Amino acid sequence: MNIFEMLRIDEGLRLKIYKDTEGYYTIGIGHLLTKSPSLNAAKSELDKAIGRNTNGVITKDEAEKLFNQDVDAAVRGILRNAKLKPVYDSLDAVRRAAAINMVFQMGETGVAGFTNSLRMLQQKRWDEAAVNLAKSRWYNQTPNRAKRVITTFRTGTWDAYKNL
Numbered sequence: 001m002n003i004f005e006m007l008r009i010d011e012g013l014r015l016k017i018y019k020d021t022e023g024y025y026t027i028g029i030g031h032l033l034t035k036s037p038s039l040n041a042a043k044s045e046l047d048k049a050i051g052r053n054t055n056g057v058i059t060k061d062e063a064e065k066l067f068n069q070d071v072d073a074a075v076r077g078i079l080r081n082a083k084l085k086p087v088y089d090s091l092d093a094v095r096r097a098a099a100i101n102m103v104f105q106m107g108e109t110g111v112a113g114f115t116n117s118l119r120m121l122q123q124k125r126w127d128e129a130a131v132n133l134a135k136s137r138w139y140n141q142t143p144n145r146a147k148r149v150i151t152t153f154r155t156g157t158w159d160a161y162k163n164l
């Protein structure tokens with residue numbers, strides 16, 4: 001198990017434009033195209049991302065290319081964010097993957113409200129942190145995924161993913 005395998009499980013793989021859990025146009029391995037309700041706008045974003053005129057369908061190789069870029073972008077974003085870098089640096093590699101997972105799903109803006117959770121994680125108060133993380137829109141809207149990510153933060157193991 002690693003961050004790539006983990007997000008592959010959580011996001012799936014679809015080669016045609018689909019709507020994510022929030023109703024937003026997406027492709028590949030959870031590559032958000034746009035929050036716009038216009039399919040044409042989404043198709044434009046896809047073409048720009050891939051570098052060719054696609055009309056809504058990509059190959060597995062192309063999906064994996066975008067996926068690698070997205071994982072890279074999430075990490076680089078954490079490292080440039082003053083509110084996130086210290087907590088990330090304080091973690092082991094397994095829990096770091098859980099951090100990347102969250103940023104991949106909700107972005108840096110989606111995680112701005114997790115200040116108290118972040119403190120508890122840096123304090124290594126794993127059970128308290130797990131309890132706090134679940135008190136969120138995130139947990140309520142995607143409970144099964146959140147539970148897996150939270151278990152990863154609580155235990156520092158891959159137990160929530162090893163069966164999957």
Ligand SMILES: Fc1c(Cl)c(F)c(Cl)c(F)c1Cl
Nearest residue numbers: 078084087088099102111121
């Ligand atoms: F280190 C982190 C980071 Cl960078 C992050 F964005 C979240 Cl949501 C998190 F929980 C942890 Cl531990």
